[PDB]
Design a protein around this motif. Sequence first.
Motif, mmCIF file in Angstrom:
data_model
loop_
_atom_site.group_PDB
_atom_site.id
_atom_site.type_symbol
_atom_site.label_atom_id
_atom_site.label_comp_id
_atom_site.label_asym_id
_atom_site.label_seq_id
_atom_site.Cartn_x
_atom_site.Cartn_y
_atom_site.Cartn_z
ATOM 1 N N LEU A 163 2.543 18.903 -46.805
ATOM 2 C CA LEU A 163 3.075 18.214 -47.976
ATOM 3 C C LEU A 163 4.566 17.978 -47.792
ATOM 4 O O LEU A 163 5.119 18.284 -46.734
ATOM 5 C CB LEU A 163 2.795 19.038 -49.240
ATOM 6 C CG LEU A 163 1.316 19.320 -49.524
ATOM 7 C CD1 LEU A 163 1.191 20.410 -50.565
ATOM 8 C CD2 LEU A 163 0.587 18.046 -49.964
ATOM 9 N N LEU A 192 4.695 21.277 -54.933
ATOM 10 C CA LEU A 192 5.128 20.417 -53.827
ATOM 11 C C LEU A 192 4.707 18.969 -54.036
ATOM 12 O O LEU A 192 3.577 18.695 -54.457
ATOM 13 C CB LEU A 192 4.604 20.940 -52.478
ATOM 14 C CG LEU A 192 5.385 22.083 -51.801
ATOM 15 C CD1 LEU A 192 5.412 23.370 -52.629
ATOM 16 C CD2 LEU A 192 4.808 22.376 -50.430
ATOM 17 N N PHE A 244 -2.839 24.568 -44.007
ATOM 18 C CA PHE A 244 -2.918 23.654 -45.150
ATOM 19 C C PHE A 244 -2.500 22.270 -44.682
ATOM 20 O O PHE A 244 -1.693 22.160 -43.764
ATOM 21 C CB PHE A 244 -1.919 24.059 -46.237
ATOM 22 C CG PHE A 244 -2.045 25.474 -46.716
ATOM 23 C CD1 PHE A 244 -2.894 25.796 -47.769
ATOM 24 C CD2 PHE A 244 -1.280 26.487 -46.140
ATOM 25 C CE1 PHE A 244 -2.991 27.113 -48.226
ATOM 26 C CE2 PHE A 244 -1.377 27.803 -46.594
ATOM 27 C CZ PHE A 244 -2.235 28.106 -47.639
ATOM 28 N N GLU A 245 -2.994 21.206 -45.317
ATOM 29 C CA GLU A 245 -2.442 19.876 -45.027
ATOM 30 C C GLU A 245 -0.956 19.869 -45.405
ATOM 31 O O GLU A 245 -0.542 20.487 -46.391
ATOM 32 C CB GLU A 245 -3.219 18.742 -45.720
ATOM 33 C CG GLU A 245 -2.840 18.452 -47.164
ATOM 34 C CD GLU A 245 -3.767 17.451 -47.849
ATOM 35 O OE1 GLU A 245 -3.525 17.149 -49.041
ATOM 36 O OE2 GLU A 245 -4.733 16.967 -47.212
ATOM 37 N N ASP A 285 1.095 28.177 -52.843
ATOM 38 C CA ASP A 285 1.340 29.624 -52.822
ATOM 39 C C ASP A 285 0.438 30.427 -53.747
ATOM 40 O O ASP A 285 0.860 30.906 -54.805
ATOM 41 C CB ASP A 285 2.810 29.982 -53.071
ATOM 42 C CG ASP A 285 3.075 31.460 -52.892
ATOM 43 O OD1 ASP A 285 2.236 32.149 -52.267
ATOM 44 O OD2 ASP A 285 4.116 31.948 -53.381
#
Length: 355
Positions: A112, A163, A109-110, A193
């Motif tokens: 955060l 996030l 994932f990118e 998630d």
Amino acid sequence: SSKRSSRSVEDDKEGHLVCRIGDWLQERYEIVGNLGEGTFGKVVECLDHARGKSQVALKIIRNVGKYREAARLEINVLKKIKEKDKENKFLCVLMSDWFNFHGHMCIAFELLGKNTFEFLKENNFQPYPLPHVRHMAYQLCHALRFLHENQLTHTDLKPENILFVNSEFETLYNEHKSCEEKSVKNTSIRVADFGSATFDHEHHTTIVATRHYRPPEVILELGWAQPCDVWSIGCILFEYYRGFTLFQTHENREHLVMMEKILGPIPSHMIHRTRKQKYFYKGGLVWDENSSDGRYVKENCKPLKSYMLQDSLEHVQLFDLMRRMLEFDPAQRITLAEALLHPFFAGLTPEERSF
Ligand SMILES: CC(C)(C)c1ccc(C(=O)Nc2cn3cc(-c4cn[nH]c4)ccc3n2)cn1
């Protein structure tokens, strides 16, 4: 070095990938930090060398059948989100890659920033200002409305799973002998998630959500769907607004009693239909008002409106929306499509509405 590191691989006795900061995966990802861990596996920060050394969070799942299978379902959910959000505007984490690394399901994932619980905690549990609560509420409604339109339910919404894109803060005050008072600069958030997220047609886990965010239909085993997420959002907004949980409990019967004291009576049809008959006698919750817990509940759990910090319109509007999200009957609970039209969101700027 990438090629050598990526091929040199073993597991520990519990099925975790034996790895440390400096190791590589797929001749592509260089591990540079640790982000967190659970029974599922680990989450590491990597540089993605095939995408300009961009920062990613990489979930590396244990080499255990149960976790591998669960991760495949998570990937399916993330694929759907990615398919349906071409402009990256619906605020659910976009998976940048996934792969099977020697039995370990890996999901990228990118990267955060801090989650909204961690930020609250680092602010000594002093709450988010109302405009922050409002902007985060709008984003949560927007994100989950999108998820819901795609026959999906998250099931585990909680502040830890929300996030900040960037959690950099400003200091408001820092007086001698007191905790620093902080506010996040940018309130842009992402929902993370999707490891419990469930399609309409799939097997529904019976007991879903984390305790504090769990709706009555789940506790009562009446079946659940998208409204589950709406209840969780209502609980999250309360916690953003006050800094403490709405339902600080770890037991079903007490939890249901708290719901009644805060929100009003449970609809009789829900009690009639629940297999959790042991919590009730003659249609009422079994509860000793005079015990130590009875006293904690009587003194701490009051009607929802009593928790307002101001009496002005925007606070009244917040509490109206929250009460609609906290409707006992999931059939009567506000949908997120409806929530997005609530007057509470008239207070937003033509800027807070850009995603
Ligand atoms: C510098 C400092 C403020 C200390 C910092 C930087 C980064 C993080 C962090 O933890 N970043 C982080 C965790 N992530 C988890 C997922 C995910 C999605 N699904 N499941 C898990 C996706 C992105 C993601 N980014 C925390 N603190």
